[model samples]
Target: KSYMAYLSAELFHLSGIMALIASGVVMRPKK
Candidate 1:
């Protein structure tokens, strides 16, 4: 239970960071 709690928290934060990076790339100019 404790491990699952920690893992879920970590994954949530990781996903947020990944999403932020993805959005930043999407907003960047390709040319």
Candidate 2:
């Protein structure tokens, strides 16, 4: 149970980071 909880937390963190990166790319000014 502890392992599963850790896995979920890591997955959530990675997904949030990916989302932030994607948002930044999309919102960046076009040159």
Candidate 3:
């Protein structure tokens, strides 16, 4: 794969991890 494609994949994975963490935080105090 091209360098740009590799970089984009890495960024996408990072964002996916962030999304999961953010969702977890948002749900923590709910009833």
Candidate 4:
């Protein structure tokens, strides 16, 4: 149960970072 809780938190953290990376790339200049 404890590991599952930690796993979920880590997954959330990873997703937040991945979302930020995606947004950054999307907003970046295409030149």
Candidate 5:
């Protein structure tokens, strides 16, 4: 149970990082 909780937390952190990267790419102006 504890292991599962830790895994879930790691996945959530990764997802947040991915979201930030995706948003940054989208907001970048075209050159």
Candidate 6:
């Protein structure tokens, strides 16, 4: 694959991970 494609994949993965963490945080204080 092209270098830019790989970089985009990495960035997508990072953004996905960030969204996951944000979701967890959003759900964390529901006590």
| Local distance difference test, each candidate | 0.67, 0.67, 0.68, 0.68, 0.67, 0.67
lDDT for position 22 in model 3 = 59
Question: Which pairs in model 5 have colliding backbones?
Answer: none
Q: Which sections of candidate 5 miss by over 4 Å?
A: 16-31
List clash counts for every candidate, in order: 0, 0, 0, 0, 0, 0
| Tens digits of per-residue lDDT for model 2, 1-31 | 6997776666556677866766667764676
Provide the global lDDT of candidate 3 against the true structure: 0.68
Residue 3, candidate 4: how far off, in angstroms?
0.3
Which stretches of model 4 miss by more than 4 angstroms? 16-31
Alpha-carbon error at 3 in model 2, in Å?
Answer: 0.4
Off by over 4 Å in 2: 16-31
* Model 6 Cα lDDT, one tens digit per residue, 1-31: 8997786676556667866765666755667
Q: Candidate 5 residues 1-31, lDDT tens each? A: 6997776666556677766766666754776
RMSD, each candidate, Å? 7.5, 8.2, 8.4, 7.7, 8.1, 8.5
What C-alpha lDDT, on a 0 to 100 scale, does residue 7 get in candidate 5?
Answer: 64
Per-residue error at 8 for model 1, in Å? Answer: 0.3
lDDT of 3 by residue, 1-31 (tens): 8998786676556677766765666755567
Clashing pairs in 1: none
For candidate 5, give the lDDT of residue 18.
Answer: 62
Model 4 over residues 1-31: C-alpha lDDT tens digits? 6997776676556667866766666754777
